[PDB]
Structures are given as structure tokens and as C-alpha cells.
Amino acid sequence: TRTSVLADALNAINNAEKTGKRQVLIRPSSKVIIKFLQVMQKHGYIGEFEYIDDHRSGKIVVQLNGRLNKCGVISPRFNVKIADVEKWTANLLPARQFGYVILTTSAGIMDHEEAHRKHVSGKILGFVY
Amino acid sequence: SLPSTFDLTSEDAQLLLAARVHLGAKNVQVHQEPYVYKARPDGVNVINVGKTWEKIVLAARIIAAIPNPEDVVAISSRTYGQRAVLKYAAHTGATPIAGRFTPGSFTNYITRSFKEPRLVIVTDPRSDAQAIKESSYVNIPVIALTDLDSPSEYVDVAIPCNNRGKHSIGLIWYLLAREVLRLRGALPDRTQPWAIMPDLYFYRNP
Amino acid sequence: MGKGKPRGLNSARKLRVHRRNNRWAETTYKKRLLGTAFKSSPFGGSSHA
Amino acid sequence: MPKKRASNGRNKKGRGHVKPVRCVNCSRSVPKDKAIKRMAIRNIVEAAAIRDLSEASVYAEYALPKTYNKLHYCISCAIHARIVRVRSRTDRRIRAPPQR
Amino acid sequence: GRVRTKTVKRASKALIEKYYPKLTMDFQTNKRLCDEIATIQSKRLRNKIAGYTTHLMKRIQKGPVRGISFKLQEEERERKDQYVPDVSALDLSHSNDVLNVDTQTAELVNSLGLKLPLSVSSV
Amino acid sequence: MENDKGQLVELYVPRKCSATNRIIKAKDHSSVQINIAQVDEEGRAIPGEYVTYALSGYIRARGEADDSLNRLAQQDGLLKNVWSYSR
Amino acid sequence: GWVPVTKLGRLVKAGKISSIEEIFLHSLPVKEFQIIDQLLPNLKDEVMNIKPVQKQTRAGQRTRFKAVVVVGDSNGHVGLGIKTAKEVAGAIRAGIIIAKLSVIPIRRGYWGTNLGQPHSLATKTSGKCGSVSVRLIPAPRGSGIVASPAVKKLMQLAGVEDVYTSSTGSTRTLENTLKAAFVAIGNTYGFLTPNLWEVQALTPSPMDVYADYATAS
RNA sequence: AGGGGAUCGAAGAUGAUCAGAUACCGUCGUAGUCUUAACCAUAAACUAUGCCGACUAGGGAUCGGGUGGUGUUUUUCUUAUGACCCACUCGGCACCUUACGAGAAAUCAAAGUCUUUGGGUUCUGGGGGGAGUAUGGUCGCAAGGCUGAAACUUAAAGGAAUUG
Ligand SMILES: [Zn+2]
């Protein structure tokens, strides 16, 4: 059974970008996927995407750019205590220059640079770069 | 963009349909592959005409771009195309290869038949599989006169053609040899059929 | 591929107990816990005698 | 000995362990899939004549029937001359029969 | 078992390729033209070149051969392929009536061009 | 690809594939350069001017070099009514 | 003596391609030995090891000597070459030739802000060969090379100052260890970054411009 | 423990071969083979590949439905079913061709989406022997299952491929 809807979305994107595609169809759909994709949309990893509304659940279609490399997920949403973000950002990303570890918290759904300014942290969802 | 002139000659539509260029492509279907216009009854397809004549002019524009003429290679192992390639080599500078390719031609500098070209033109991807696959080792583009049966391994700019036999090989090289000379060459005007002849290509009696 | 082992947020118990079983398949761990050095090994589990 | 063939004894697929059948020569038990089934039709009179019987006989036309004997051979027995003959590595793959 | 060797056929190809003139049928005249140009040490090997070169002249009057066909032989085709026996008429115009195309091919003309000659068949 | 204030550090600022937007490596022997001529009024061709493309060896081996060329050509204006958006 | 074959060989002898970039940018082959000697002056040319290898014969065996050699300088170029001749010292001559033909660039960076010149890898790269995976992994200033002595010589020729490693597998096989690391160091140019997203004009190659001077007239 | 008991048949008799043959070959041959009530719970119980879920590549066959075709026939006249053909579609047993991926390699469209490592979850393993033995439980009328050690010995045992 599809226990993680968020994992199915980012899995389908990786197989498309590997083959050399410019469009992906994610079926299950959610609020959290739309919040996750809009962070990628700001930093230039993904172009435009449009939500098809079946009178039922949802269906998303994305436009790939040719910039992505990997878009991963970490399923057991571990708790993070601001100072311990240095462990996760070092391992999951390459280099200290750029990359994003997309996490969730009581403010909203931030990247690790955005969350550092506010002095705020919580659970983790996934990453890019 | 384009000269707003080469809009497919209405007289040349008679030459294509008489030679059976757009009356086949077999039942079998590789799935690239949008060069079609519906299926005829009893296991026969129909190739679109406007798509072919556009791509032949596109192929001529790539051949015209190279500065040194004696460079673009024409290849044919199939016995029908052997006569057509020899004519193309005579009109404009283009070293031909008839029959066997001899493996290690583009690679391996010891060989007597050592080419080092910047463009390859092929008749059949099926029979000339050695020519297309081995050309990838030293960064060479390809042009293929394919039909809907043959594969697309390293095949750039594939002109849709009819590889059943006889006529359409002779006609497509005749139109290529014309369009190469139209853009930088002998002919100062596109009008007047030009002669020469299509039947100077073709298969002969043994 | 879930890699066999339980990757749950509340898996704690099974993760700890599975390894106390698998720890017994190592000679240095097995001989330290059971203590054959005292009961065997002619010396009294010592350097010199 | 690693993996030799993919299909092996062949047709037991989407199916449990099947009925066996006895060989002709050895009287040895072997599966019906892994059987080597030749079908040998023979003229009931031997072709070395064949005229000599029909010359002296009664009636015109004459039926002159044929026996329809289906045979089975337990692999090792078939390597003695029967439908096998050991093959090369890539020659194994040809499922198309020789001749016809 | 008189199979001629490779070193005989090395000379037999090299001599006939360049010097197609000075080669006419018989042994004795062509034998005098082997020692003419080349510098062979022995008599046996010298005369054995004359044997196989003269044998190729018997076949050359009954068509060509693969690998041994140069200078005159490429030109001795050649008009036959260049100025072909055909063409009387065009040919392949609309000599036999005016295009016997199919139903689907007739419909294909309407989208692209406008009007060609059509004797449309029902298939 | 940058440093403090003065100049750009690095060499070989590499070519990206026109179809996929993927970096073409130095030893990737298979990559190609399609140079297409610039036509003028009533035949002709402008000498020393091209509409250049570049394809990676990855997609060329796959089989979608021909389909990718007609997509690029129709947008630049080197073709008419060949490659369809909807299919 | 010199005397070139092929179009690029004649082009370098005239003296138009400087050193080097125009070969690597446009992905041109380099089959001639004499090109890299003309372009790059500084080359080492250091031998790693020599294995006698046996093939079985009906009455004896055939001793043949493999020769692993590394090539580079101290800026950002490295190479590798293996060859198996029956002469021992002659195989080193053959090994140095082949390694020059497969010389390949490297992309360096930071490592924690710019300030001055770069002296380590930009991104975390890796390469596999057989069953030996290598992983690197930049460092800060003043850490030095942290790898096996065999791998250390390959990194010294590259001009990389500071880098960590994490080899995993049967790493004693010195051919597969270096050849796996050669993919990891060669895969630096390939991984996209925020810097390389900006679009460039597609330039004409040396072969297109200088067509008439090359080729035998 | 009952019934049945034709054929083949461990034990066993009994002819040859053999230096010996109580082994293969042959002639017979008890139990067993079949069933009715109980038991036993193991096999190369092998696709030597744990289940549920996505996504990635083409190609025709086939077994079951379900669609449409003035299609072909059946012919009792249109029939109307059926049975054949052409295209399409869900589910299933399988195959072919390529690897861009994976792998130590044989090979694999899953053994792919893993140093760019994280979809959910059960089970088993940690050099070779001693050993599936000792001992103690527990289960069976028995045969034996399930559970399951160490002292002590040793530098190799092994997998896939290449030459001879
Ligand atoms: Zn048998």
C-alpha cells in the first residue's frame, strides 16, 4: 500500500530526469507535495507545474528544467534541535556552498538557510542538490 | 528562417508518387515515429509527403554548411544504392564507399582506405550497421534515408523513405544532389526541371 | 527495497533486541560474556604464571 | 556447476510437479516435459520390395496402411544417436528445428 | 597439387595492374616482358610469374575479375554506366495513363498540395 | 567558477546539450555538432553563418536525436508543420 | 623526426591551438603521441608497479610484464596508462605513451569561501571499477592528502592540496584502485552547479575554421 | 489395525560374469504399491530468487472476459446466436531484442531506481572443521522431528571465469 504519498512523488521525478524527460505525472497528490514543490520552484530547480482537479483527490503534472540531480526523502521524520542541523546538512548535501534540506516546522515548510534566520526547527521531510 | 519560396514544387509531387515513395513503409512499426498519414487496408501504411521534402532541404542545409567539399562521405552496401552513390560523388565533391565498409576506417590510421570525415550519408541502417555504429567513436554526424522498419541507433536527421526496392533510392539521391547544388553551386534559378535525369540513378540490368 | 530491518519511528525495541541475538555470533564477544578464559585456558585468564 | 539453461527440463512453469512416463529402450521413469518426443511413421511393408507384395495380390488401388508409433526417450538414452547431438554455447539457444 | 603460391600472385597483380599494355595472350611473348621490368634472381620463380599473368589474360576476354581491374578496365566499362542504354522516352513520366494511385494516397494530396493527375483505384 | 574579485577561475566552461540541458564531457566520444546554413532570398546561402546545435552521446544512442532536432528546428524557424506538440 | 597523420596533428605543428582547452572543450580525439608533448612541457611520468603475468603453454609458460604509469603536472591535468609487453623496461616506454593520450582535466574549488586560489575538489564525487568504490570529499586548508600511498601520487600530480578519502572493497588490487579513482577525479566536470546554469553561445570549433590548412593538399 | 492382493517389486532366494561380486544383467520373490479409520511432518518441498506498493523500454504470440468494425462466412431467406478475421482494452502463464542501468562474473526488465546510500514490514547469516553431534527440555506407539553448545584443531575451505 502507498504509505508515503510524498515518497512516490519525488521517486517519479528522479526516474524521469534520469531518462532525459521534460514532464512528469504524479497521481496521488497532496498539500505537502505542493508545499514541497514551491520551495524547489523558488530556487530554480523546477519550472512550472499545474494541479489537475479530479472531483475526488488530486493529480499533478510538472515541467522539468534540466537542472535537478537528486530529489530525496527521509521517511522516519526525525526530530532536529537547531544546533544538530549541521549533522544533516553535511551528509545529505555535497559541499558547504549550496544545497537545501527541506524541513517542516511550526512557522511553515522551510529550507535550512531560511530556518537558520528565524532560529526555528522541527521535523525533516527531504532534500535537493 | 526560410526563403518563402521552397514550398514543395507541384511538378515534383508527380515524381514522388510515380516512384512509390509514399506507398509503403510495411506493417512493422518502430515507435519514434510520427512520419505517417493513416493506414491502408490489407497491411500497408502511408507516409506523409510534406514531412519528407522538408527534411531533404534540411539535410541539404547541413551539407552546404561545410567549407571543404571533399569531406562528406556517402555509404551503401546494398546493391541498389551503389549506382546512386557513385553519381552523387561525381556531381559534388564527396568521396563514396560502395559495397563493403572495411571495419576500422574512421578509426585506425594504418589502413589504406582511411577516411577522416565530418559528415556521413547512409542509405540503409540495416545493411550499413557497421558504418553508423563505428562513426560514434570520433564525433561524426549521420544522415540516413530510412523507412519505418529500421532502427535509430545514432541516427540524426532521418529522411522518411521507402526501402522496399528499386525506385525511391534513385529518386531521393537525385533530389539531394539537386538541393546541394541549388544552395551554393551551378543552378542560378530553382525553376526549370534540370536535366540530367532521375533514371541516370536506379538499378540496371545485370 | 526496505532493506529488511524495521525502519519505524517507534521501532526502538526490535532494533535493540535483534542485535543482542546477533552479537552472539562473534568469538570475542561470546568468550568475554560466557567466560571460558576463567574456566579453561590453563592459566587463570592472566599474562604470566 | 553453475546455471546451464534457463528453461532446464522445459515446460513445468506456472505449474507444480507433474506426471512421469516410461522410456522405450531402458524402461526408466522420466517427466513427460523432459521426454524427447519423436513421432516415427513407418510403412507397414518395408520399402526394400515394395512392389513384390502388390504384384501377386488381389484387388486394385490397395490401402497399404502405416503404423503411427509415438516414442519417448530418457535424455541419456537419446544421446546414443537419437534427437540430441551435443551443441556449442550459443548454438543451444536455437529452438527452431533442423530441416523443414 | 600445383597450387600457385602467394609470392607469385604478388607479382601477378602488381604487373598486370600497371602494365596492361605489353600483355597479349600467349606465353612466349609475355614471358619476355616479365624479366624486362622486374629484377628476379632465379629462372624458376621468374617463369612462374609469366604462367599466372598469362592465365588472367584468358579470363579477361570472358569478363572482369575482382581485385585485378585498373587503368583501362575502369574506363572500359564505363560510358555503359555513365551514358546508360536507357532512356528512351523520359521514362517514368505519365506515359501509361495518368497515375494509378490508391484511395488513401488520393486523399493525402488534398491536405498538402491541390490537384495532380489521378486515376484513383479502390484498393 | 568565481573568486573574490578578480577574474573567473577554471578552464573549459563546458557545452550543454540543447535538448536535455546536460553537460557534455571531454572524453564523451559520441557527442555531435549540427551546423545548419543561413538561407537568403531566392535560393543562396550566407557564407560563414550557422544555426548551431549540440547533442549529447547519451540521447543519440537512445534513439531520440531525430525527434529532438525537429523540436529545436521548428522553434528556431528552420521547419514548418512537422513536429506536433500534442500527439 | 616528426611527420604527422590526421587533421589535428597538422593543426598543432602550424601552431594555432595554444595549450590546451580548444581540444577538451569541443571533445576532439587525440590519437597521436606527439600532440601533448608539443602542448604541455611539464610531464611526470612516474611508475607504480610491475607484475609478471603468466599464460599457460603445453611445455612451459609465458612471462609478460604489465606496467602501470601515472601522468600529470601541478595545475589540473592527470592521466593513466597500462600495457603488457614481454620486455620489462620497454613496457615503461609503451605505458608513458598511452597515459599521455588519455590526459583528462580536473575541476577544483572551495572548501569554505573564496579568499584566494582554489586547492581542492568542488563537489563530493565517486567512481567504481570491479568492486572498488572511491569517495572524495573536500577538506579545509592545511589538512593534506589523506589516502593510500598509491592513490596519494595520483592526487599530487593533479595539483590538489587537501582532500579526504573513503575506499571500500578489495583495495590491494592496484589497477582497479587507481582506475576507479581516475573516474571519480574525471567526473568533476559533469556535475551541474548554480554557477554553470547560465547559458553560453555555442562556439565554432578549430576544425570548422581552419579546414583548408589541415588535410593533405 | 482392518479390508484387498492383477502387475511391478526393498529384504531374500537363484543363474552367469569376476582375481573376489552377497554389484550392475536374468528367473522368481515376502513387505509395500490400492483403499478405510488413525498416525508421522520431512525432500534438489528449487524459479536453489520473502510478501504489499510505486516508477522506468521496445516487440509480437497466447489463455480468459469486455468493447467496436455495412469485415468474412454459417444459410433456414435479412437472419439471430455461434465460429473465424482487423484494431483496442483490463488480468495471467510465459518468451524474444537491447542494455543507457546493475553485477565478482555467469547472467538479470528485475538480480534496475544504492557511497547522488532512508517507501512499509517478517525471517535467516558472520573463516573452515568438530556438528545439526553432547546435554537439557519438548513432541511422537516407534522411526525420528523442533530446539541446539563447547573444549579442542587449522590457514585456508569456497564462487565465477581464462589458458593448458
Ligand atoms: Zn531410456
Numbering used by the authors:
A (entry chain W): 2 to 130
B (entry chain A): 2 to 207
C (entry chain X): 1 to 49
D (entry chain a): 1 to 100
E (entry chain R): 2 to 124
F (entry chain V): 1 to 87
G (entry chain C): 39 to 255
Task: Give excerpts from the publication.
The GTPase eIF5B is responsible for the correct functioning of the second checkpoint. Molecular interactions of eIF5B with other correctly assembled components on the ribosome lead to GTP hydrolysis that allows the machinery of protein production to transition from initiation into elongation. The protein consists of 4 domains: a GTP-binding domain or G-domain, domain II, domain III, and domain IV. The G-domain and domain II of eIF5B are functionally associated and are responsible for the bulk of the binding to the ribosome and the GTP/GDP regulation.
The reconstruction exhibits a slightly rotated configuration of the 40S (∼3°) and contains a tRNA in hybrid p/PE configuration, where the Anti-codon Stem Loop (ASL) of the tRNA is deeply inserted in the P site of the small subunit, and it is base-paired with the AUG codon. The L1-stalk is displaced inward, stabilizing the tRNA in this hybrid configuration. Unexpectedly, eIF5B has been trapped in its active conformation, even in the absence of contacts with Met-tRNAiMet. Kluyveromyces lactis subunits and eIF5B in a slightly acidic (pH 6) buffer background were used in this work. A stacking interaction with the sugar of the 23S rRNA nucleotide 2997 aligns tyrosine 837 (S. cerevisiae numbering) toward the catalytic histidine, which is in its “active” configuration, inserted through the hydrophobic gate.
